[PDB]
Amino acid sequence: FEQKHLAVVDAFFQTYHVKPDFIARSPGRVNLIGEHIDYCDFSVLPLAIDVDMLCAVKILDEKNPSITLTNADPKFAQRKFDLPLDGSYMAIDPSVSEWSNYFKCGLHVAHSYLKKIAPERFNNTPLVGAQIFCQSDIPTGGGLSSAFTCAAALATIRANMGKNFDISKKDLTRITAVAEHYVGVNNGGMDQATSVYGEEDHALYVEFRPKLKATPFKFPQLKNHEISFVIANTLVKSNKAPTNYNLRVIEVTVAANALATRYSVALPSHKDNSNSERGNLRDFMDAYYARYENQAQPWNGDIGTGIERLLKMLQLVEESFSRKKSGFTVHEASTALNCSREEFTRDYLTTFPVRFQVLKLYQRAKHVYSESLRVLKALKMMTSATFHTDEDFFTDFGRLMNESQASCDKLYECSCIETNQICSIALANGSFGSRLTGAGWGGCTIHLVPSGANGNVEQVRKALIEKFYNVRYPDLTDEELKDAIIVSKPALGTCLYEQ
Amino acid sequence: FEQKHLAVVDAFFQTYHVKPDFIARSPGRVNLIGEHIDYCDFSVLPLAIDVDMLCAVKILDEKNPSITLTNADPKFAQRKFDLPLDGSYMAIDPSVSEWSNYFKCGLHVAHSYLKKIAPERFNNTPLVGAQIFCQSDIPTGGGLSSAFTCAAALATIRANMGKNFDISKKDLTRITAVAEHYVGVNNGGMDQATSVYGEEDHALYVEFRPKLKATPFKFPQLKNHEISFVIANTLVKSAPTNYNLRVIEVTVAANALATRYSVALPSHKDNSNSERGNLRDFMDAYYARYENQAQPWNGDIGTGIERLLKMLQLVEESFSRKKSGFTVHEASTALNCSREEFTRDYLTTFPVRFQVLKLYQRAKHVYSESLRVLKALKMMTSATFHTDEDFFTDFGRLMNESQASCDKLYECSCIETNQICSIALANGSFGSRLTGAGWGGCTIHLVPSGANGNVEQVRKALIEKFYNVRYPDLTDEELKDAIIVSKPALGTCLYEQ
């Protein structure tokens, strides 16, 4: 925690032989509830975690500004580059796995912000030079790309505007979320918003309509436990199909349109932000309410209205699709959309490769609406629910995580054997709730585990090491094993520490 | 080569101890001109090739119908499955990838077709059983999936409908094109169309607008040379910086053009390889608005050459000062929308990595490459070749111009591709380019064949100067599969025994 902050200052001094002017820090992130619903515009529940990227910076006074980047990790070699004298953006090429790319993204988005607020200073002049020491303990799955981008953007703003300049969380989130198109990631700004808005003891309600937005919600005060989460990687690379993500995108879009057709409503064009180009399952929920519930206004994120309308949606899903759980062939789907096979193929099967015999409209729609509902039930538990013992909190919240896992697996089919093994082991050995998190088909898992003296952290971690990692991956080094399992409480978002 | 049929029938007998009833055959395919333009609805120029899937079949009369599939390759283990007694379709699981998948695809699409023509005959009754020996010499990049699917569909029609009934090429192409979503391939039916409609000495003008359609075009008869093509694999397996980025770039380019010229992109009323308005749609919108040709381009070649030349002028007028590419901010401005709306509409569901969108280069590629297809067809049908070298040169130049476009404008070549082509042209090839998905995969080279041909000159050059260097530890079998030679081939057909 504070130990880490000193280590980075001290290593900066070893490297550059001068005290740094400041440190910029930004935390990793993980999603606690709400998987595979963001591209239907539904809100998710992430948290910032206590692994981070730390960037110690000395600001330079140079005729020709340059930036030097050194990393604590020996495998990431030192980088040095000159800032363009004309004030133009640095050249970045994302056809490389270069460790400094994320810094360059941050530098870039900060630069364009600075050009906006102070044109006469930054339009035709380079930014200031710097010596930078970077140190991260964020493992795979913990969102290094957004943390580094955010720390780098704040460091650039601080270096060029001085310590008495403040950028709001709202602006820092907006400008860094643009970096998704430099990184090759599509979480709609959720990663950046979490790294920026994180607070200790809080998860974030992250929304996308009408705008990317984050609202902190504080976990209940417990009598004598602490809330922690164990995050365990399957070590199956999620990033690595026509049967997976592309297929899901088609299925939920077809589902939204099958519902729209069945209930005779149109999906209104997006007038604001959206994580989809076309009408989606949230749009259907709004269109349905507007027509059948007396000009009901579109859902704008309050918990009570959300719960009521999502429960209604699950009813419409039973009514519309429950007699077709074996899925829809292209022919049956065309009929459900009141269009020809040619129209269907044109609209849904053209751009991206997909592989399927049937489209599982029942399952995919049921997942999205029920998973979106669990986000709201989680919020309700955190805020207004009463628990007569700490155990009741862990049991009820954990049960939502388990119900989420069961849905992701059985309804969305985005789990894998490694995920299920880890979850089962964790639950038999101290976890109250266990689920995949992230892109699915591999990647990370997250576990609700009481921490402290009366907690289960070491019990869960020991069982996972012995029953999963030692079995499936005998040759992992100590370092790899350390990265594979981390323990975290909710953490504070992007910030500066003056030095 | 026609010893194939003998050696397939013999192998069948060695497996099932009985003579087969018929052989169903479907050729592999390759694209000759027209890379990365099909998803903008532009037409391509493929050909069926001298490698094929052969399915020797004995039709079985059984109480409980079963299909046995045996392969000529011993590493593909025999498969046997009973046919669903409720007339249900087989289980084509999408996750498991095994060699019999393409067969089940063909079986499925043929079965569905049969149910529609004779419901009382096929609806709740299984198809007839069979013993089947499958022999393919199609290499990677050659389109085994479509060949095997088409051969299997035809084998299934034949076994169930008798020797006299012949499915139209039209219907066979229609029903097999559907199988793309069972395989996980999205070539808009081009593969199936090529495999079905191939003819000796012909390439195919394969159109997608307003419908999937294939029209054979004969190569010019030459005096003392023969037309052949060397197909050489880079052995690099065919990304947010690649295909995804290209789809976004061409979609944004069409809208920047539509915005610049104040037109709306016409909706799709028939077939299309894109969900949204594309570069072909802009061509139709521009013509309806400024050239009083309210009618969308119908695929006519002369007209097409005219309109594509026009589009290229507009690309220069609209984008030539922005070869640096467009930032997201600049792209939003060119579309007259906010960054939020640009991001929502163009950057949402599929991952991409870019600093700029290269609207000039990508639009220039798609229109110029589509134009090269038409020029190829025009060149093929015109009688202006006084010498054979006139043809090999002029056609080769179109191929070379295409390769340069793919490489520099679309940036979908790779070093292995570029090396292979450079070697080929300096050693007997008249024209050399990548073919297929790009960023690896196969390459195709126009090479005169026969007594006074350069086939062996090119092949030796590639083996000694590319493969032996880059891939020293290639076995003779691998090194053999990497390079094949073909002339245009006949499409799907049956041989009664």
B494: three-class secondary structure by DSSP: strand
d(CA A28, CA A39): 22
DSSP state letter for A336? H
d(CA B495, CA B163): 10
**A456-470 as b/e: b if 16+ CB within 10 A:** bbeebbebbbebbbe
Indicate if A374 and A289 belong to the same structural domain: yes
Stated as kind and residue range, the H or E segment containing B24 is: strand B22-33
**Bond before A94 cis per omega within 30 degrees:** no
Q: How far is C-alpha A332 from the chain's CA centre?
A: 35
d(CA A234, CA A468): 9
* Pair B357, B325: CB distance under 8 Å: yes
* Pair A275, A37: CB distance under 8 Å: no
Residue of chain A nearest B91, judged by CA positions: A357
d(CA A426, CA A153): 38
Structure tokens at B360: 């000039």
Q: Do B184 and A273 touch (CB under 8 A)?
A: no
* Pair A247, A358: CB distance under 8 Å: no
Catalytic residues of A: 191
Residue A454 neighbours by CB under 8 Å, 6+ apart: A224, A225
- Cα distances (Å, whole numbers) of residue B451 to B50, B196, B447, B456: 19, 31, 12, 10
Could you tell me the resolution of this structure in angstroms?
2.1
What is the number of H-type helices and E-type strands within chain A? 18, 12
Q: How far is C-alpha A80 from the chain's CA centre?
A: 31
Closest CA to B352 of A111, A179, A348, A347: A179
Which structural domain, as residue segments, surrounds residue B198? 1-218+487-497
Indicate if A421 and A409 belong to the same structural domain: no
Kindly state whether A348 is in contact with chain B, defined as any CB-CB distance less than 8 angstroms: yes
Kindly state whether A189 is in contact with chain B, defined as any CB-CB distance less than 8 angstroms: no
d(CA A219, CA B279): 52
* From A182, A186, A350, residue closest to B273, measured CB to CB: A350
**Chain B residues 59-118 with a CB less than 8 Å from chain A:** 89, 92, 94-95
Residue carrying the six token digits 């340069």: B404
Cα dihedral A134→A138→A144→A147 (10° resolution): -70
* Pair A155, A134: CB distance under 8 Å: no
d(CA A92, CA A83): 12
**Chain A residues 229-268 with a CB less than 8 Å from chain B:** 241-243, 249
Amino acid symbol at B113: Y
B178: three-class secondary structure by DSSP: coil
CB atoms within 10 A of CB B5: 16
Residue of chain B nearest A276, judged by CA positions: B348
Among residues B389, B411, B433, the one where a domain terminates is B411
Among residues A366, A385, A413, the one where a domain terminates is A413
Q: Do A181 and B95 touch (CB under 8 A)?
A: no
| B chain contacts of residue A241, beta-carbon cutoff 8 Å | 184
* Pair A486, A142: CB distance under 8 Å: yes
Structure tokens at B419: 């090396």
Instruction: Name the H helices within B328-406.
Output: 328-334, 339-346, 359-381, 388-404
Indicate if B186 and B223 belong to the same structural domain: no
d(CA B260, CA A95): 31
List the B226-233 sheet strands across, edge first: B431-435, B442-449, B226-233, B483-486
* Pair A109, A48: CB distance under 8 Å: no
A343: three-class secondary structure by DSSP: helix
Indicate if B60 and B186 belong to the same structural domain: yes
Length of chain A, please?
A: 499
- Whichever domain contains A156, its CATH number is 3.30.230.10
Strand partners, B79: B69
Indicate if B154 and B90 belong to the same structural domain: yes
* Pair A193, A494: CB distance under 8 Å: no
Q: What is the largest CA-CA distance in chain B?
A: 73
* Pair A360, A243: CB distance under 8 Å: no
d(CA A98, CA B249): 24
- Whichever domain contains B464, its CATH number is 3.30.70.3170
- Whichever domain contains B261, its CATH number is 1.20.1440.340
Strand partners, B56: B23, B133
Indicate if B491 and B476 belong to the same structural domain: no
Indicate if A13 and A151 belong to the same structural domain: yes
* From A274, A277, A355, residue closest to B181, measured CB to CB: A355
**B11-24 as b/e: b if 16+ CB within 10 A:** bbeebbeeebbbbb
* Pair B150, B106: CB distance under 8 Å: yes
Stated as kind and residue range, the H or E segment containing A303 is: helix A303-321
Closest CA to B29 of B189, B172, B212, B248: B189
* From A273, A350, A353, residue closest to B272, measured CB to CB: A350
Indicate if A277 and A368 belong to the same structural domain: yes
Indicate if B120 and B208 belong to the same structural domain: yes
Strand partners, B497: none
Q: Do A346 and B180 touch (CB under 8 A)?
A: no
**Chain A nearest CA to B163, separation (Å):** 30
Residue A440 neighbours by CB under 8 Å, 6+ apart: A35, A36, A238, A244, A245, A408, A412, A414, A415
- Exposure of A326 in the CB half-sphere (CA atoms within 13 A): 4
Q: Do A184 and B275 touch (CB under 8 A)?
A: no
How many domains are there within chain B? 3
Stated as kind and residue range, the H or E segment containing A437 is: strand A433-437
**Chain A residues 418-437 with a CB less than 8 Å from chain B:** none
Closest CA to A321 of A263, A372, A373: A263
d(CA B281, CA B18): 56
Q: How far is C-alpha B296 from the chain's CA centre?
A: 25
d(CA A21, CA A496): 11
Indicate if B58 and B165 belong to the same structural domain: yes
Residue A477 neighbours by CB under 8 Å, 6+ apart: none
* Pair B345, B266: CB distance under 8 Å: no
Kindly state whether A330 is in contact with chain B, defined as any CB-CB distance less than 8 angstroms: yes
**Chain A nearest CA to B40, separation (Å):** 10
Opening angle at CA B390, ends B387 and B393, nearest 5: 145
Structure tokens at A380: 């309700």
Residue carrying the six token digits 């199609």: B138
Q: Do B184 and A351 touch (CB under 8 A)?
A: no
Q: What is the interface size between A and B, counted as CB pairs within 8 Å?
A: 108
Q: Do B186 and A275 touch (CB under 8 A)?
A: no
d(CA B47, CA B444): 12
* From B241, B272, B275, residue closest to A94, measured CB to CB: B241
Indicate if B153 and B260 belong to the same structural domain: no
Indicate if B418 and B402 belong to the same structural domain: no
* Pair B342, A269: CB distance under 8 Å: no
* Pair B43, B208: CB distance under 8 Å: yes
Among residues A374, A389, A413, the one where a domain terminates is A413
Closest CA to A313 of A251, A359, A270, A255: A255
Q: Do A185 and B351 touch (CB under 8 A)?
A: yes
* Pair A259, A368: CB distance under 8 Å: no
